């Protein structure tokens, strides 16, 4: 069962502080046996998990009802929230396996 990793759009978000920064992770899923994870890269350059679908407080994931897309938002985004973000699909269908997205950049502009 060869399946492709999810995609994480947009590649660059430039949000003013205090607003809601919304990424969109899209996953063409071979099965229903999977969860989704939203990672943010640390200064140590490995994934820190923020939130997962299904289930912090400022990191909410929602399932867009088209069966393909997910909204992963930063509510009241702070300045130091700028960094590298990505999503990852964890399949539970035969052979548990994690396939990360392409990393995307977030920039928060000061008011």
């Amino acid at each position: 069962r060869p399946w492709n990793p999810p995609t994480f759009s947009p590649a660059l978000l430039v949000v003013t502080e205090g607003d809601n920064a919304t990424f969109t992770c899209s996953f063409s899923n071979t099965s229903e046996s999977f969860v989704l994870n939203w990672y943010r890269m640390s200064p140590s350059n490995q994934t820190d998990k923020l939130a997962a679908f299904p289930e912090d407080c400022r990191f909410r994931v929602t399932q867009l009802p088209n069966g393909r897309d997910f909204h992963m938002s930063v509510v009241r985004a702070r300045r130091n929230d700028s960094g590298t973000y990505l999503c990852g699909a964890i399949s539970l269908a035969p052979k548990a396996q994690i396939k990360e997205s392409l990393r995307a950049e977030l920039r928060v502009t000061e008011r």
């Binding site: 759009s9 947009p10 590649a11 660059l12 607003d19 919304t22």
Partner: protein, 230 residues
Amino acid sequence: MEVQLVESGGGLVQPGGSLRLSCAASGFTFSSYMMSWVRQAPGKGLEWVATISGGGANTYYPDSVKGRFTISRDNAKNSLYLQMNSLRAEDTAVYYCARQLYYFDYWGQGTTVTVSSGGGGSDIQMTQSPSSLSASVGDRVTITCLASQTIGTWLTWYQQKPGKAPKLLIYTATSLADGVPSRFSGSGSGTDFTLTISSLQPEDFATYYCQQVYSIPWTFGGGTKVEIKR
């Protein structure tokens, strides 16, 4: 007998309104002296506004009031007039009439003219979602607009590509303009509104603006630039 100049006519006017000023003269032969209006806005200094000749045959104005202001005199009534049309907020000042030869020897005590607007800060302000973004062809982008006050569904979406005029995309916040692809979608009512591009195409390289049409001043959002990234 002393020389006396008495001004009347000042009041509150809205910008673009009109006002007329009078100045009653006595104590000299009014027909042979040049008259002039000099004004002084609050806290600032003096500036000259208009001048009429003794016989009324010659008038003089600065560029700031030309076409707007018209000085006139009625030598039979010994009075001076200043007709102020299309008033601006900069015209707020105390206006003195004065006798002019090569100095202003006699001055009236002035009448206060105020040009102001009560609109203040009741304007609706629109803010837009990511200020800019960079996605690839085929991605699903979503753009939000926010209104300072409730506007129902009186929100508009425009698309402006570089070097071109804005194109109407969505009116009444859900409807789709003629000749717009079906991939553009609009949602929301009251304060929060969203523009969604179902599948980014190469011809969607543009900046997108929102606009409320509920009440004047009809305000726009800051815009959201969508780069098709390398």
